[PDB]
Write a protein that binds this ligand. Sequence first.
Ligand code: CB8
Ligand code: CB8
Ligand code: CB8
Lengths: 134, 134, 134
Amino acid sequence: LIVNVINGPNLGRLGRGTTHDELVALIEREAAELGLKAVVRQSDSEAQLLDWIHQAADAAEPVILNAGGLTHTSVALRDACAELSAPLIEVHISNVHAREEFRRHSYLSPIATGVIVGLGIQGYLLALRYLAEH
Amino acid sequence: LIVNVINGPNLGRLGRGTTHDELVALIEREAAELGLKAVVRQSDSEAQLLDWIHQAADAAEPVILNAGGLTHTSVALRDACAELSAPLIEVHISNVHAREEFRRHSYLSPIATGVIVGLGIQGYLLALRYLAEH
Amino acid sequence: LIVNVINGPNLGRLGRGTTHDELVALIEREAAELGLKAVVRQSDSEAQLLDWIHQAADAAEPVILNAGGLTHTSVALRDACAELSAPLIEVHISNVHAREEFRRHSYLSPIATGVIVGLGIQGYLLALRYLAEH
Ligand SMILES: O=C(O)[C@@]1(O)C[C@@H](O)[C@H](O)C(OCc2cc3ccccc3s2)=C1Cc1cccs1
Ligand SMILES: O=C(O)[C@@]1(O)C[C@@H](O)[C@H](O)C(OCc2cc3ccccc3s2)=C1Cc1cccs1
Ligand SMILES: O=C(O)[C@@]1(O)C[C@@H](O)[C@H](O)C(OCc2cc3ccccc3s2)=C1Cc1cccs1
C-alpha cells in the first residue's frame, strides 16, 4: 500500500495556484482511489531528504521523488536512492528540457525506474498509477 | 528601508582581521548612514539560506547575497533567488575570477541584478549604496 | 594525540557487513595501538560537516575525511578544509576511479595531503598510521 512522495528544495513555495498543501491533498485522494497510501514529505534540507530515502530503503517502499534543484547537483542524494529496492520514479512539474542546459542533466534519472517531466502536478498522480498497476 | 544581507558557508570564519561580527557592525553603520536598515544573517546550512531567501521573497525585500561555495554549486539556491521581486546583488569579498576555474562560474550571476567581486568587505557597502540610490 | 575522522552522507548506512559503529570501533582500536585518540563523527548534513572541520581548524588537529557524495560536489566543504593547518587525508572505501566518470573528480584531492581509495575500511587505518609516523 505505501508510496513515499518526497519533495525537495523550493517545493514548499508552490502556489505562493496550487499550494504544496493542496498538492498533498490531491496526491492523497488519488492514492486512496488507487488503493494505496501516499506519505508526502517536503524539505529544503538535503540531510532530511536523505533520511526519508534511508527510511524507504529500510522499509522496502517505493519513492516518487521531485528533488528540485538537487536533481542536478547532488551525488549524495543519488547514492542514497541507489539503496532503494522498490521502484523510484523521478518527477518534475516543469519540462526541465525546455530551459537552461544545466537542468537537462539529472543525477537521478540513470538510477530511477522512470522519469515524468512537464506534466505538471498530474505527474505525481501518473507516477502513483504506475506503482498501483505494478 | 530593509535590506537583507545573507552570508553563506564559511563566512562565519572571517577574521579567524575583520570578523563576521565586525562585518555586521560595518554594514549596519553604513545602512544607517544611507537611511536603510540592514538585517545581516549567516549560515553554513543551505536550508537556512533558502528560508531567509523565501522570507525576502514574501516581504518583497532586496537581498545582498554572498553564498560562499554554494555560489558555484547550488541550483536550489539560485531557484529560491529567482522568486525575489526586489533586486539581488551578488557579492564576493575575493576576486573569484583570479583563482580556480570552477570559481569563475556562478549559478547566481545570471539572475542577479548585478555582481561585485574582489573589493573586499567594502563590496557589501557599495551594494547597500546601490540599493539606497535606486 | 587527536585525529578527527569525519564521515559524510550515507556513511551511516554502512553494513545495512561492517556497520558504521563497527567502523568506529575498528578505528578507535587502531588509534589506541598507534598512541593516538581517534574522534569519529558522521553526518548527512553538510553544515554539520563544516562545523566539525571548523573545530579541527581551530584546534590545529588533523582530519581523515570521507565526504561521500560531497567529495564530488561541494566547494563549501573544500573551502572549509583549506583552513586546516594540520594534514588532511581524503579516504574512500570504494575505488572511485572504477565506476562513473563524475566520481573521478574530487574537490578535496587538490587540497589534501594525500588520498587513499579502494582499500576498504582499512584505508582509514592506513591513514591513521600515516599520521602516527609523521
Ligand atoms: O520542475 C520541477 O519540478 C523542478 O524539480 C525543476 C528543477 O530543475 C527546479 O530546481 C525546481 O525547483 C524550482 C521551482 C520553481 C517553481 C515555480 C513555481 C512554484 C514553485 C517552484 S520551485 C523544480 C520544482 C518546481 C515546481 C514548480 C515548477 S518547478
Ligand atoms: O570571495 C568570496 O566572498 C567567496 O564567496 C568566494 C567563494 O568562491 C568561496 O567559496 C568563499 O568562501 C571561502 C572563504 C575564504 C575565506 C578566507 C578568509 C576568511 C574567510 C573565508 S571563507 C568566499 C567567502 C570569502 C570570504 C573571504 C574571502 S573569500
Ligand atoms: O567509496 C567511498 O567511500 C565513497 O566516499 C565514494 C563516493 O563517491 C560515494 O558518494 C560514497 O557514498 C555511497 C555509498 C555507497 C555505499 C555502499 C555500501 C554501504 C554504504 C555506502 S555509502 C562513498 C561511501 C561508501 C561507503 C562504502 C562504499 S562507498
